[PDB]
């Protein structure tokens, strides 16, 4: 895993916000 998923997922979402 959830950790690696949270990071990869979290970032993926972020990049979308910025962007």
PDB file of N, CA, C and O in Angstrom, unseen atoms left out:
ATOM      1  CA  UNK A   1       2.339  -2.857  -0.901  1.00  0.00           C
ATOM      2  C   UNK A   1       1.523  -1.585  -1.070  1.00  0.00           C
ATOM      3  O   UNK A   1       1.518  -0.970  -2.135  1.00  0.00           O
ATOM      4  N   UNK A   2       0.832  -1.200   0.000  1.00  0.00           N
ATOM      5  CA  UNK A   2       0.000   0.000   0.000  1.00  0.00           C
ATOM      6  C   UNK A   2       0.867   1.249   0.000  1.00  0.00           C
ATOM      7  O   UNK A   2       0.536   2.253  -0.628  1.00  0.00           O
ATOM      8  N   UNK A   3       1.985   1.172   0.716  1.00  0.00           N
ATOM      9  CA  UNK A   3       2.923   2.286   0.818  1.00  0.00           C
ATOM     10  C   UNK A   3       3.386   2.721  -0.563  1.00  0.00           C
ATOM     11  O   UNK A   3       3.186   3.866  -0.970  1.00  0.00           O
ATOM     12  N   UNK A   4       4.008   1.791  -1.281  1.00  0.00           N
ATOM     13  CA  UNK A   4       4.511   2.050  -2.627  1.00  0.00           C
ATOM     14  C   UNK A   4       3.387   2.520  -3.535  1.00  0.00           C
ATOM     15  O   UNK A   4       3.606   3.284  -4.474  1.00  0.00           O
ATOM     16  N   UNK A   5       2.177   2.053  -3.241  1.00  0.00           N
ATOM     17  CA  UNK A   5       0.993   2.411  -4.017  1.00  0.00           C
ATOM     18  C   UNK A   5       0.546   3.824  -3.683  1.00  0.00           C
ATOM     19  O   UNK A   5       0.121   4.580  -4.556  1.00  0.00           O
ATOM     20  N   UNK A   6       0.647   4.173  -2.404  1.00  0.00           N
ATOM     21  CA  UNK A   6       0.258   5.495  -1.922  1.00  0.00           C
ATOM     22  C   UNK A   6       1.169   6.563  -2.505  1.00  0.00           C
ATOM     23  O   UNK A   6       0.714   7.620  -2.938  1.00  0.00           O
ATOM     24  N   UNK A   7       2.466   6.272  -2.510  1.00  0.00           N
ATOM     25  CA  UNK A   7       3.471   7.192  -3.036  1.00  0.00           C
ATOM     26  C   UNK A   7       3.287   7.382  -4.533  1.00  0.00           C
ATOM     27  O   UNK A   7       3.109   8.499  -5.016  1.00  0.00           O
ATOM     28  N   UNK A   8       3.333   6.270  -5.263  1.00  0.00           N
ATOM     29  CA  UNK A   8       3.175   6.284  -6.714  1.00  0.00           C
ATOM     30  C   UNK A   8       1.836   6.892  -7.098  1.00  0.00           C
ATOM     31  O   UNK A   8       1.742   7.683  -8.035  1.00  0.00           O
ATOM     32  N   UNK A   9       0.798   6.512  -6.358  1.00  0.00           N
ATOM     33  CA  UNK A   9      -0.554   7.006  -6.598  1.00  0.00           C
ATOM     34  C   UNK A   9      -0.671   8.463  -6.181  1.00  0.00           C
ATOM     35  O   UNK A   9      -1.183   9.299  -6.924  1.00  0.00           O
ATOM     36  N   UNK A  10      -0.187   8.756  -4.978  1.00  0.00           N
ATOM     37  CA  UNK A  10      -0.223  10.110  -4.431  1.00  0.00           C
ATOM     38  C   UNK A  10       0.420  11.092  -5.396  1.00  0.00           C
ATOM     39  O   UNK A  10      -0.158  12.122  -5.735  1.00  0.00           O
ATOM     40  N   UNK A  11       1.630  10.756  -5.836  1.00  0.00           N
ATOM     41  CA  UNK A  11       2.381  11.592  -6.768  1.00  0.00           C
ATOM     42  C   UNK A  11       1.607  11.774  -8.063  1.00  0.00           C
ATOM     43  O   UNK A  11       1.375  12.894  -8.515  1.00  0.00           O
ATOM     44  N   UNK A  12       1.208  10.652  -8.657  1.00  0.00           N
ATOM     45  CA  UNK A  12       0.454  10.655  -9.907  1.00  0.00           C
ATOM     46  C   UNK A  12      -0.669  11.677  -9.848  1.00  0.00           C
ATOM     47  O   UNK A  12      -0.907  12.415 -10.802  1.00  0.00           O
ATOM     48  N   UNK A  13      -1.358  11.708  -8.711  1.00  0.00           N
ATOM     49  CA  UNK A  13      -2.468  12.633  -8.496  1.00  0.00           C
ATOM     50  C   UNK A  13      -1.958  14.061  -8.395  1.00  0.00           C
ATOM     51  O   UNK A  13      -2.534  14.984  -8.970  1.00  0.00           O
ATOM     52  N   UNK A  14      -0.867  14.232  -7.653  1.00  0.00           N
ATOM     53  CA  UNK A  14      -0.254  15.542  -7.458  1.00  0.00           C
ATOM     54  C   UNK A  14       0.071  16.183  -8.797  1.00  0.00           C
ATOM     55  O   UNK A  14      -0.422  17.261  -9.123  1.00  0.00           O
ATOM     56  N   UNK A  15       0.914  15.503  -9.570  1.00  0.00           N
ATOM     57  CA  UNK A  15       1.327  15.983 -10.885  1.00  0.00           C
ATOM     58  C   UNK A  15       0.123  16.471 -11.675  1.00  0.00           C
ATOM     59  O   UNK A  15       0.226  17.386 -12.491  1.00  0.00           O
ATOM     60  N   UNK A  16      -1.023  15.845 -11.423  1.00  0.00           N
ATOM     61  CA  UNK A  16      -2.268  16.195 -12.098  1.00  0.00           C
ATOM     62  C   UNK A  16      -2.807  17.516 -11.572  1.00  0.00           C
ATOM     63  O   UNK A  16      -3.380  18.311 -12.315  1.00  0.00           O
ATOM     64  N   UNK A  17      -2.614  17.739 -10.276  1.00  0.00           N
ATOM     65  CA  UNK A  17      -3.070  18.960  -9.617  1.00  0.00           C
ATOM     66  C   UNK A  17      -2.255  20.154 -10.085  1.00  0.00           C
ATOM     67  O   UNK A  17      -2.800  21.172 -10.506  1.00  0.00           O
ATOM     68  N   UNK A  18      -0.934  20.015 -10.004  1.00  0.00           N
ATOM     69  CA  UNK A  18      -0.012  21.070 -10.414  1.00  0.00           C
ATOM     70  C   UNK A  18      -0.162  21.362 -11.898  1.00  0.00           C
ATOM     71  O   UNK A  18      -0.407  22.498 -12.301  1.00  0.00           O
ATOM     72  N   UNK A  19      -0.009  20.317 -12.706  1.00  0.00           N
ATOM     73  CA  UNK A  19      -0.123  20.431 -14.158  1.00  0.00           C
TER      74      UNK A  19
END
